[PDB]
Amino acid sequence: RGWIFGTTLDSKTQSLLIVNNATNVVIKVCEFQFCNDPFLGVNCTFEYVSFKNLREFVFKNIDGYFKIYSKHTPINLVRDLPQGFSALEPLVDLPIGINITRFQTLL
Amino acid sequence: YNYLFRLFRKSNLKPFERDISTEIYQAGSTPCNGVEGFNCYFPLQSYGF
Numbered sequence: 262r263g264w265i266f267g268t269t270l271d272s273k274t275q276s277l278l279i280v281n282n283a284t285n286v287v288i289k290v291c292e293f294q295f296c297n298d299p300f301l302g303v304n305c306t307f308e309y310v311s312f313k314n315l316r317e318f319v320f321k322n323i324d325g326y327f328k329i330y331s332k333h334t335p336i337n338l339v340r341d342l343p344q345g346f347s348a349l350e351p352l353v354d355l356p357i358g359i360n361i362t363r364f365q366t367l368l
Numbered sequence: 369y370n371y372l373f374r375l376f377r378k379s380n381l382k383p384f385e386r387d388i389s390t391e392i393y394q395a396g397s398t399p400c401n402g403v404e405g406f407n408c409y410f411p412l413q414s415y416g417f
C-alpha cells in the first residue's frame with residue numbers, strides 16, 4: 262500500500278511518502294517522522310493526489326523529477342515471478358526536487 | 369536579511385537538486401560534532417541588501 266524514499270529517510274531531512282488510501286494515491290514530500298517499522302493502521306513542500314496476481318513497478322529519479330511505471334496482471338504460477346514477458350507503462354513524472362539514497366515498503 | 373545563500377557544501381548540486389539542510393559545515397581542522405567553532409561554520413549567509 263505504499264513506499265517511502267529519501268537520504269536519511271526520516272527526521273533531519275526531506276523524504277517522499279507514497280500511500281494508497283484505498284480510494285486515491287496520496288503523495289507528499291516533507292521532513293517526515295516515523296517509527297523504525299511503520300504500519301498503515303485504520304512541511305508538505307510537495308503534495309499531490311490521483312498467489313493470484315502480480316503487480317510490477319519501476320521507480321527512478323533524474324534531474325529532480327521522479328518517474329513511476331507500472332503493470333498489473335493475474336498469474337497462473339502460485340510461487341513467484343512467472344517466466345514470460347510484458348512491458349510497464351508510465352504513470353507519473355513528479356517534480357520532487359530532492360535527492361534519494363534509501364527507500365522502504367509499507368504494508 | 370530575508371534573502372540568503374549557501375556558502376559551502378560537501379558536493380555540487382545535480383540539475384534542479386534542492387537543499388534546505390541547516391547542518392554545520394566543517395571548514396578545516398575542527399570536527400563539528402553538531403556545534404559551531406573555529407573551522408566549523410554555519411552553512412548559509414545573508415545578503416544584507
Ligand SMILES: *[C@@H]1O[C@H](CO)[C@@H](O)[C@H](O)[C@H]1NC(C)=O
Binds near residue numbers: 292306
Ligand atoms: C520546515 O519548517 C521548519 C520550521 O517548522 C523550518 O525551520 C525548515 O526550514 C522547514 N524546512 C523545509 C524543507 O521547508
